[PDB]
Amino acid sequence: TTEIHPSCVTRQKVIGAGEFGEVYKGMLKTSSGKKEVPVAIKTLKAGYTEKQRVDFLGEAGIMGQFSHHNIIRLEGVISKYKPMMIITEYMENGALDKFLREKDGEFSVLQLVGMLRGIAAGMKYLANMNYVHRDLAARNILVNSNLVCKVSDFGKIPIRWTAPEAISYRKFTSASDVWSFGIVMWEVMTYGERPYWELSNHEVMKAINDGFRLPTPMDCPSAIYQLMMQCWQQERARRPKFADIVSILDKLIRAPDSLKTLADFDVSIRL
Numbered sequence: 678t679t680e681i682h683p684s685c686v687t688r689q690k691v692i693g694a695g696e697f698g699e700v701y702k703g704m705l706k707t708s709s710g711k712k713e714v715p716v717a718i719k720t721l722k723a724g725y726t727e728k729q730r731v732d733f734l735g736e737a738g739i740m741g742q743f744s745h746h747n748i749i750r751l752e753g754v755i756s757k758y759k760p761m762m763i764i765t766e767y768m769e770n771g772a773l774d775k776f777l778r779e780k781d782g783e784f785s786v787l788q789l790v791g792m793l794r795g796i797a798a799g800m801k802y803l804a805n806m807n808y809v810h811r812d813l814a815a816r817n818i819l820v821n822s823n824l825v826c827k828v829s830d831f832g833k834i835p836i837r838w839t840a841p842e843a844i845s846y847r848k849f850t851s852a853s854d855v856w857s858f859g860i861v862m863w864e865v866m867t868y869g870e871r872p873y874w875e876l877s878n879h880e881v882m883k884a885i886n887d888g889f890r891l892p893t894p895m896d897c898p899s900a901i902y903q904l905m906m907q908c909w910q911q912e913r914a915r916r917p918k919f920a921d922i923v924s925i926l927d928k929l930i931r932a933p934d935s936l937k938t939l940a941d942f943d944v945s946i947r948l
């Protein structure tokens with residue numbers, strides 16, 4: 678993890694604030710002063726506890742182990758000066774869930790499937806690097822100006838994205854992340870609809886344990902709905918691996934007529 682000198686960082690705008698720190702958009706001077714890049718900068722405010730420091734610096738330590746197109750890139754940290762900072766690449770379109778809700782209906786099927794392929798490729802890499810995300814959801818994916826989606830937020834757990842064995846037994850593995858990816862597929866194809874709508878957490882658990890699953894999104898390719906349904910097998914060993922998901926999505930994208938067979942969606946009487 679690269680320690681960045683504070684003279685190389687400038688903050689221009691607040692992105693968001695918390696009771697523990699803020700996130701800024703800024704610039705980072707790199708490469709011996711010959712290069713300047715936009716960055717996101719997260720701070721940890723004075724008075725933080727040892728646990729907070731371990732978690733904050735731990736998120737950057739995890740992020741710095743990875744080098745993949747679909748995983749947010751860490752530029753480095755400021756730990757020797759206060760406030761401490763984590764510095765990442767800047768993703769111009771922010772969080773995927775909010776982005777899709779602000780772009781409802783505006784992308785093609787192929788674009789949405791390509792976003793899911795990118796997220797799956799980042800998750801395949803994390804899983805094979807022996808990392809279980811445990812909080813995979815479209816709110817934790819960021820989107821750049823070129824529509825590339827990257828897994829972030831490597832730092833309670835929303836029930837409605839979590840596989841049943843992780844809810845009950847706290848058995849979190851890459852297969853429970855596959856369940857969560859299935860919910861992200863449904864979020865993407867619905868432009869950010871809230872999984873399970875008004876059901877309470879216990880009602881979501883009730884429905885899932887009775888075998889209910891989220892219904893097809895509108896205008897969703899049958900193959901895409903079949904794949905998200907497989908992600909939601911109750912028996913975790915029956916779920917696809919991320920390697921299978923990436924392979925299937927690639928085959929669909931390469932033969933895009935395969936995406937024209939739509940799953941049935943389901944009163945206005947008129948004619």
Ligand SMILES: Cc1cccc(Cl)c1NC(=O)c1cnc(Nc2cccc(C(=O)N[C@H]3CC[C@H](C(=O)O)CC3)c2)s1
Nearest residue numbers: 690692702717718719763765766767768771772829830
């Ligand atoms: C993911 C992560 C973990 C730990 C540390 C850090 Cl620094 C990160 N990185 C980040 O949080 C972010 C990387 N890129 C981000 N982009 C982002 C997220 C949410 C909203 C926006 C967004 O649209 N911000 C605008 C709001 C309006 C202004 C403008 O540019 O017109 C200023 C910036 C951008 S946040």
